[PDB]
Amino acid sequence: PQQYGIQYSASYSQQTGPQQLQQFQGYGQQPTSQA
Amino acid sequence: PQQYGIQYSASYSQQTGPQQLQQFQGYGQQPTSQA
Amino acid sequence: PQQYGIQYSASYSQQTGPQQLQQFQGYGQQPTSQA
Amino acid sequence: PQQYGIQYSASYSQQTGPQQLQQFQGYGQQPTSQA
Amino acid sequence: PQQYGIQYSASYSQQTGPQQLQQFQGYGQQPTSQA
Amino acid sequence: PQQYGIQYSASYSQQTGPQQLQQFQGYGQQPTSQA
Amino acid sequence: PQQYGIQYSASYSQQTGPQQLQQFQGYGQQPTSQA
Amino acid sequence: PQQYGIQYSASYSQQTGPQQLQQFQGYGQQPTSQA
Amino acid sequence: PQQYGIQYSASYSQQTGPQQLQQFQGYGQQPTSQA
Amino acid sequence: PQQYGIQYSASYSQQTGPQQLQQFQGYGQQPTSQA
Amino acid sequence: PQQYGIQYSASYSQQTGPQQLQQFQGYGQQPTSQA
Amino acid sequence: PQQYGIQYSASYSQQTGPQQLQQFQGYGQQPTSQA
Amino acid sequence: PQQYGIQYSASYSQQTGPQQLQQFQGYGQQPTSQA
Amino acid sequence: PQQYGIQYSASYSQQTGPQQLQQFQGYGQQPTSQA
Amino acid sequence: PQQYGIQYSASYSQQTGPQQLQQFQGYGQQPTSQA
Amino acid sequence: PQQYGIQYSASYSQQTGPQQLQQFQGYGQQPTSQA
Amino acid sequence: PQQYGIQYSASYSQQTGPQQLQQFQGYGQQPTSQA
Amino acid sequence: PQQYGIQYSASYSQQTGPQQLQQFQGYGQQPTSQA
Amino acid sequence: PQQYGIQYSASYSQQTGPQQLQQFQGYGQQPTSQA
Amino acid sequence: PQQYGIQYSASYSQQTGPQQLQQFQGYGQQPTSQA
């Protein structure tokens, strides 16, 4: 099992804003609750 | 099992706004609740 | 099993707004509840 | 089993608004409930 | 089994509004309920 | 089994409004209920 | 089994309104209920 | 079995209103009920 | 078995109103009920 | 078995109103009931 | 001067196809030309 | 001068296809030209 | 001068397809040209 | 001069597809050109 | 001059697809050109 | 001059897809060009 | 001159996808060009 | 001149995806160019 | 001249993803170029 | 001239992801270039 978020190869990246990368491998849970 | 979010190859990327990448491999749950 | 979100090859990308990429491989659940 | 969201090859992309890409491979459920 | 969302080849894309791409491969369910 | 949403080849695309592409391959269900 | 939503070849596309493309390959159900 | 929604070849398309393309290949059901 | 919705070849299309294309290949059912 | 909805060849089309194209190939049923 | 497109009062509406409603109040012109 | 597109009062609406509502109040022009 | 697109009062709405509402009040022009 | 796009009052809305609302008040022009 | 896009009053809204609301008040122009 | 995009009053909103709201008050221009 | 994007009053909001709000008051221009 | 992006009053907000708010008051220009 | 990005009053906010707020008051320019 | 980014009054804020607030008052320029 291989998991790759972002890959660049001879490329140009310009990122001016906010960026979020969340990875779960296996048994991942992301619960959000607002009571 | 291979999972790839974004791939660039000899490319140009300009990203000025917000960006979110969430990966789940295996057994992933993303529950959202508002009671 | 291969899963690819976005691929660029000798391309030009300009992204000025918000962007969301969510990947589930295997057994993925995205429940949303509003009681 | 191969799954590809978006592919660019020697192309030009300009995306000014919001963009959502959600992928499920295998056994994916996206339930939305409003009680 | 191959699944392709959008493909560009030597093309020009300008997308100014909101865009949604949801892929299900295998056994996918998208239920929406409003009680 | 191959499934292709949209294909461009040496073409020009200008999309100013909202766009939705939903793909189901295999055993896909999209139920909508309003009780 | 091949399924193609929209194909462009050396063409010009201008789309100013809302657009929906839903594909089912295999065993697809789109039930809508209003009780 | 091949299924093609819309094809353009050296053509010009201008679409200003809403557009819906729904494809079913195999065993597709689109029931609508209003009780 | 081949099924083609609309084909353009060196043509000009201007579509200002709403447009619906629904394809069923194989065993397709479109029941509408109002009790 | 080939099924063609509409074909254009070096033609000019201007469509200002609503348009519906429904295709059934194989074993298609379109029942409408009002009890 | 009052102009009403469609009115429902304790009624049940099921609309499965495309629908277009265009209203002009005052001095409205809808010319269509194909030269 | 009052202009009303669609009105619902204690009613049930189920709309499964594409829908377009364009309103002009005052001095509205909707010309379409294909040269 | 009052302009109302759609009004709901104690009603139930289920809209599964694409929907477009464009309003012009005053001096509105919507020209479409394809040369 | 008052302009209202959509109004809900004690109502239930379920919208599963793409939706576009464009308002112009005063002196609004929406020209679309494809040369 | 008052302009209201969408209003909810004691209502329930469930929106699962893409949504676009563009407002112009005063002297607004939305030209789209594809040369 | 008052301009209101979306208003909620004692309401429930569930929005699962992409959403775009663009407001122009005064003298606003949104030109899109693809040469 | 008052401009309001979104207003909530004793309401419940659940937003799971991407969201874009752009406001221009006065003399605002949003040109997009792809040469 | 008052400009308000989003307002909450005794409300509940749950935002799980990316969000962008851009305000221009006075003389604002947002040009995007891709040569 | 007053400019307000987001306001909360006796409210509950839960923000799990990326968020961008850009304000320009006076004479603001946000040009993006990709040559 | 007053400029306010975010205001909280007797409120609860939970922010789990990345957040960006950029303010320009007077004569502000945010150019982004990728040659």
Numbering used by the authors:
A (entry chain S), B (entry chain O), C (entry chain K), D (entry chain G), E (entry chain C), F (entry chain B), ...: 265 to 299
Article sentences:
TFG functions in the early secretory pathway by regulating the transport of secretory vesicles between the endoplasmic reticulum (ER) and ER–Golgi intermediate compartments (ERGICs). To perform its role in clustering vesicles, TFG self-assembles into homomeric cup-shaped octamers via interactions encoded in its N-terminal Phox and Bem1p (PB1) domain and a subsequent coiled-coil motif. Within this region is an LCD (residues 237–327) rich in proline, tyrosine, and glutamine that functions to further polymerize these octamers into larger assemblies and phase-separate. Mutations in the TFG LCD are associated with degenerative neurological disorders such as Charcot–Marie–Tooth disease type 2 (CMT2) and hereditary motor and sensory neuropathy with proximal dominant involvement (HMSN-P).
